[PDB]
Assembly symmetry: D2
Homo-oligomer: 393 residues x 4
Amino acid sequence: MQDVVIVAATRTAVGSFQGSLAGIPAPELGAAVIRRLLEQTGLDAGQVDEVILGQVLTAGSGQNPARQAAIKAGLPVGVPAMTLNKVCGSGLKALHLGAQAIRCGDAEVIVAGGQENMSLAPYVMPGARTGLRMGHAKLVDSMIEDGLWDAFNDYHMGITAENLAEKYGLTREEQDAFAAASQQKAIAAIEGGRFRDEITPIQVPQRKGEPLGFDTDEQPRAGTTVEALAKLKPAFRKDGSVTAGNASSLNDGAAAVLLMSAAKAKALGLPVLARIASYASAGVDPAIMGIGPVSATRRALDKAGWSLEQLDLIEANEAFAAQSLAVGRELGWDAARVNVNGGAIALGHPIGASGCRVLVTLLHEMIRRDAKKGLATLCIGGGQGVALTLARD
Amino acid sequence: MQDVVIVAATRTAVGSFQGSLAGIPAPELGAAVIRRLLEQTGLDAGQVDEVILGQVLTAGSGQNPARQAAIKAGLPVGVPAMTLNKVCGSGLKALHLGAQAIRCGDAEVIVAGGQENMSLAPYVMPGARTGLRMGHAKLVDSMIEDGLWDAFNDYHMGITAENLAEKYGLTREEQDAFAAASQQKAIAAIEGGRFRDEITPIQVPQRKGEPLGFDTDEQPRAGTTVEALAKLKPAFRKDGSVTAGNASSLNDGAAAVLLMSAAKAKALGLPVLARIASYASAGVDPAIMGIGPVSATRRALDKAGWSLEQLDLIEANEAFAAQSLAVGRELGWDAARVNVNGGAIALGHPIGASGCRVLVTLLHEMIRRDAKKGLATLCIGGGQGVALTLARD
Amino acid sequence: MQDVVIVAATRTAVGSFQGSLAGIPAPELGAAVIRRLLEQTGLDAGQVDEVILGQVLTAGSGQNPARQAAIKAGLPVGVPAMTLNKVCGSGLKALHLGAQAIRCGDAEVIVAGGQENMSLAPYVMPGARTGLRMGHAKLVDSMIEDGLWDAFNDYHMGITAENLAEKYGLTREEQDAFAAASQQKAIAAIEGGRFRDEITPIQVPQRKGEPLGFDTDEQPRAGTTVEALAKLKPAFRKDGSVTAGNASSLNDGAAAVLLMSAAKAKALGLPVLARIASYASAGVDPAIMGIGPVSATRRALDKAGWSLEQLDLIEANEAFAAQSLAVGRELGWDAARVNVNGGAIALGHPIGASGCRVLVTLLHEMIRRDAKKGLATLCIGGGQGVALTLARD
Amino acid sequence: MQDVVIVAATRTAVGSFQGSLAGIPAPELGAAVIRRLLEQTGLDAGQVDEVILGQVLTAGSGQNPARQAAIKAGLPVGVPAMTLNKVCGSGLKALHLGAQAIRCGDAEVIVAGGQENMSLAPYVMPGARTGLRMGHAKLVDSMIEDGLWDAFNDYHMGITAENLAEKYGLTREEQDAFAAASQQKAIAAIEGGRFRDEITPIQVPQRKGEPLGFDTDEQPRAGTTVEALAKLKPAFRKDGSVTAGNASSLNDGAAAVLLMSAAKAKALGLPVLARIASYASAGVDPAIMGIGPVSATRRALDKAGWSLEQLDLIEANEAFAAQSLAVGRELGWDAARVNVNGGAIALGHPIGASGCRVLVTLLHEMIRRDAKKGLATLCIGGGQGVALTLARD
């Protein structure tokens, strides 16, 4: 069996909804991060064994979005590719599948991550194929239906967040305070240059002129305070506490890593950024999907033989302030080690990419701080979680 | 690393386009086959570690089709699930992923396979979200765009078949002969009860009355003859050889297997139906995607330590007669051992399920013949192939 | 000023929803009745001064449906045409506009009537032009929105019928009895050949074979009784009395007359079928639009100098049994003189044509019985009415 | 038979496509002009006998757009209303219908004109009702299909303009000169306050703030020059002369007049702005529909007993410079008396309102010039024309 290492890790800056990446299909964002990984390592494209990319919103995307990213990146036709959907966890579960293929010797080199363009997710017209017959019909927002709506309880992810606010007695004010601190940390990280190493610029075609470079996360909102956030109306339930300001946003982006066997990295003479110590999935009740990270984290820590207090750094994707605070209540983690450069409330949640986006952020901040142990974890719509651990010597 | 064994294998009958399963969402087809695997083995649903399902056409399907099948089958919320898309190969690649998880010790019990309802694939309206502005616009058939259209060359899978007919000099007459034999063999197998053991009936809700059981493959065309096939118009190109009669059809169905470690099967007292001896993916030129099975097959045989001559029985998915003939010409296999109960020209190509559909059909025929060594292989839109080997003592 | 006469009058048989005329656009139904009027009179097409046709549902119908009917009928490009919309009254109001043009000497010969294909009325997608942005959207049934829904009260025409059932204390049983008698009278008229003279057959193109003649009204339902009708659920309101069986149906058809000055008819040597004695419109509260015929009838009788009891025959379009019984309560007419060959509950309500359809039925039954005075009247969605009187010597 | 007089005349400013009126449904534009006519004359709303409004694009507009304008303007439910469609001529034909009703003694007071919101014309999905079956389908721009496309020849109104440019040998340079002059004249009229007396302001709801008044025509393009027009690409045919700069635009607006018998105006003490001396329609070849004004004008002059040389002032709607030049060549009129404040190339062509828009502009200019004899004329898609004459003492 082989040990699995990361030799390159990169992401796009994260675009806002109908923002800077709104014209660029998800597989072109994937292609741009694949090219960068090969540039950073000087790796011949022929050395890649597989491309594994998460993407949730694939209506009208064409055959196999992961194959589109691989071909558009200039990888030869001989490199196989697959797309996966574990909703919000897709981009991290891609690394789990790549690690598995490398551990059992099916591959030595894998590109793994995710890509999502929520801006470009289309409307869908069920029933037009066979006949609507009569009566007004529903033109379905595929982003909501396929990305943000619970298939079992017939309500938004935001109601799952209301459920956790109730269960843990989390107040509006606690949720707003968490949201403001995420904003403050993201703006400080951006201004402090903490995202420069991890970001691949996208050359965005303009209406007129040469392309403009997009290289700076654009979701964070200056001047976010508990006082401004207190004015917002509840977004999902009349007397609710979850708002657009303490929830993650809608976003565009891609993120990927170059996985290898430790043996292959050494044979190529590539420096190792981190080893993968463990990975895990878990399932929970869809009604409280935001708690998925608790069991996923405990399983990953158990598989690595670690205790939570040994983690130097944690990236716990911020689907909703209520969801994040609920995970922190259950795990009893030190919040000062969690999302130290800000989280998805400030930076965005480009669903199928977020799992790899938070992993890339974790890895670069671990290198900066000389951290030895880190965890990436995400909740998943439909009631699941993923977690993955990274180690450095 | 553990042997990976199959302890149960089942599929729906395959429905024709707007046929018997046209009202049943893909995940309900998946739920029905997962329920049957547990019934056949008497396994408690809590013993399942993961559900891995292929499904290509997911526009408006809701969050995580695989998770929807797992929950609807009565698996507990604790069982994680993921959907994958390797287009035509999705349903077989799912067993490769399940094999990897078991070989790494990440799981002991995996449900793997695929599900597709082409009848229900909707229309998509790109640009409606941001504004069509003016001018007539294209309402996109997601079944064609996401399932049947090459993303690189902007033409139908059927043109890839024409490309193979031209390259191998495969005549209209040889393609129609292959298609007639597929029909004759499938009809003989159905009438002979050859598919009874492998089929899970679906109770189809009726507008009026108690549900009707669907348990008989409905795509095969009785009294097909070469003389009748000779009269059809080319389906994809003016002077082409590929027709509706020598191409696969549009279909609905699901298929799944219950994978275990050899150790777990022994501890439960479950008989081993077959061992997975190897599996592989390959990439080829998208323009001739139908040839993907050649290198996928050669890699899977190399990984098993087997020669082609050692295979007793082969299931090679029939995307098009031209594609199936080309693969047979390159590999030089004995056609008498290939698709002995008919293939997809007769039985249908429910894209994301086909990979597991042909594996289920391979396994049941291997048992009746006392075959020791079997191969399942598929071409994949976008220029890929998958192959997997079965061994019996 | 000129006196206005009818020298020819004809209609299609009325098609059921997705019935025999479901493939034939409204202007082709109009063209077929225009051709017949000219055949019946031997009139040179160049003698027509104008074509005035009602059509309500014109979404995607192309420029000026009335001009399409005129050109398709073979009338020269020199004949002007206009389309009008007075909803349910369009096909009778067309005769009012033609009568006005003839009375004041603007024209000597006019084709007037209406045409509707409700089967072909399309779905409409508001907001797609400028952007739906996010959220599920409404795909609008144009037939409901433009034809059957009140623009002021935001409810169906059927609620206006519930309002009249309340106001006049009309029971479910009274409404069902009216519906059954309409069915019985329509079937007796069809079987007795009372519609043969007034109907122009349509040659309906088939999937395979030569066209099939459609010449027999297909909406009437044999075996309609108060006992069968008693089983139906209320169609518009939970504890309501209006059902699909005591309401008019959805239908396809066209109907037109050839109007002339009495002077022009005499100069051409054409026999006069009837003179137009008077015409009128009225407005009422949209909430009780079904009562529109009361004031419209009184104004038309006043303009002709007639009393209601002088009418030998009345065609009062049956939007809903409640609506019809309410009009009869207000006017105190002899019900034995109303809709003697059945009404719209049995024969259908092809909205934009119905006004001329009931006029053509009135005229032919007046000739059969040697009636001297007749009235055609219709209620109109949005709260209006039309009425027109016919005389014979 | 009574003289028909105009006692009030007003129009909205004309909005550009997705400009100031882009959020205001056509019938609300109509309501605003009807309210203004009553305010200007101090007429009680109960004195109106009918509302006759043109509107071409009615897909999803709801029952009877004219009735919606009448009710929203505060006319009592007793006032009947009808919508008409004579495409580009609808807004003028409405006054012809109103004139006829008054000449026959059917009415004493009619509101007549037209209304259009092209910005709000929706997309249509033919075939969704009965089933698209498979294959990419056409989402129809109803503005193009129902407003701008010839139903007989299957090409744009702009090709009818090319047909006239070829037939009359009208150069690109002569078309651009005509277009530049239309722009220069409209801008001079706006800046001079020439349209203040004829315009009813619309209070436009704003996302945030009190409504903003829209009272200034926004289609005209300041600093238009022949040198700038010379650079534009042909809009309809590869080597054509018709461009976006020498064609009318897409627009939103409404216009209406208050018509009375001479007797009724006298009895109310209302001054007569003008008398309608005559009106006419004509039909021509759809391929050269732009020439419709020639025979319509000749018929209207014949009916008034006037020669072309007696006209002081002409409004000839500018569908295209090529179309306007062709009409001028055939009639031989003095261009200095035509569209003296600019026309539709500059001011816009809100299809169903244009007929009344140009009549309102004619009447206000006739008053300032003390013109005695005026003509308004329009070409009509489908091969028609309308013309109407105004007299002042």
